[PDB]
Amino acid sequence: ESADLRALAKHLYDSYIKSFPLTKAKARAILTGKTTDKSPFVIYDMNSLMMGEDKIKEVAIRIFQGCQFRSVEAVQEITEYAKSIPGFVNLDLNDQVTLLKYGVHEIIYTMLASLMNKDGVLISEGQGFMTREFLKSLRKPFGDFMEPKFEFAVKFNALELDDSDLAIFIAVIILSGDRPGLLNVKPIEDIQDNLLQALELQLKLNHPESSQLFAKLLQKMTDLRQIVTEHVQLLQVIKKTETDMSLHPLLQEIYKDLY
C-alpha cells in the first residue's frame, strides 16, 4: 500500500511539473532573489505601472482585464494537470466539467499563494512584481479584489508546503465528490480517498516535525471554498456597477450558474 501511494505522489509531482511552467520553487527563488534570471520589474505606483506595462482604458480596468487572461491560462494548465490524475479522464465528461467548474478557482488561489509574499505578487511568468499596497490603492471596488487572497496566502505560506505536497493537495481538491450536479459520486470519492491517503503519507514523510499538518490542510480546503464564495460575490458587484467590463468567454462559462 504505502509504496503505491509514493508512486502516486511521484506521478502527480511529475505531472504538476509538466503542467505548470512557474512552480513554487521557481517563484520563491525569484521572490527571495536567489536566481540568475533578470530581476522582475517592480510595479508600485502609476508611474512604474506605465514604465513596466511592456515587460508584463482606465487603470483598474486594465489590470482587471490582464488578471482575466492570466486566469484563463491557469484554467487551461489546471485542466491538463487534472487529466493526469489517474482515473479522472475515465469519469463521465459531465462530471469532469463539473469538477473543474467548481474547483478551478480554489486551485487558482492555492497556486497564487506560491507567487505571493506579504508585500506583493509575481505577475507575467515572474517577469513583474506588483505590490500589495499598489493593488490596495486602486479605486473601489477593485482595491479590495486581491486583499483576501493576500490574507489567505500569508497564512497558507506559513505551512511551508513544497511543490510535491501541493501537487497532491490540488488533486484532492479537484476530486471533490460534493460538487453540485455530479452524476456519479462514488468513483470520484474512491479516487479522492486514495489521494487523501497519499497526501497524509506525503506530509508525514516530508514534514515529520509538523504536527497535524494534514488536519490543517483539510481546513484550508474549507477556507478556500469560502474565499471563492466571497470572490463570486465581489464579481457580482462588478457587473452591476461597472460597464466596459465583460469577462472572457471561458470565464463567463465557468461563472454561469456558479454559486
Binding site: V75, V97, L100, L250, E253
Partner: peptide, 15 residues
C-alpha cells in the same frame, strides 16, 4: 448531456 451542453469551451479543453 446538460452540463456538457452548457460548457462548450471547457469540453473542448478536456477532449
Amino acid at each position: 448531456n446538460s452540463v456538457x451542453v452548457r460548457h462548450x469551451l471547457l469540453t473542448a479543453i478536456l477532449x
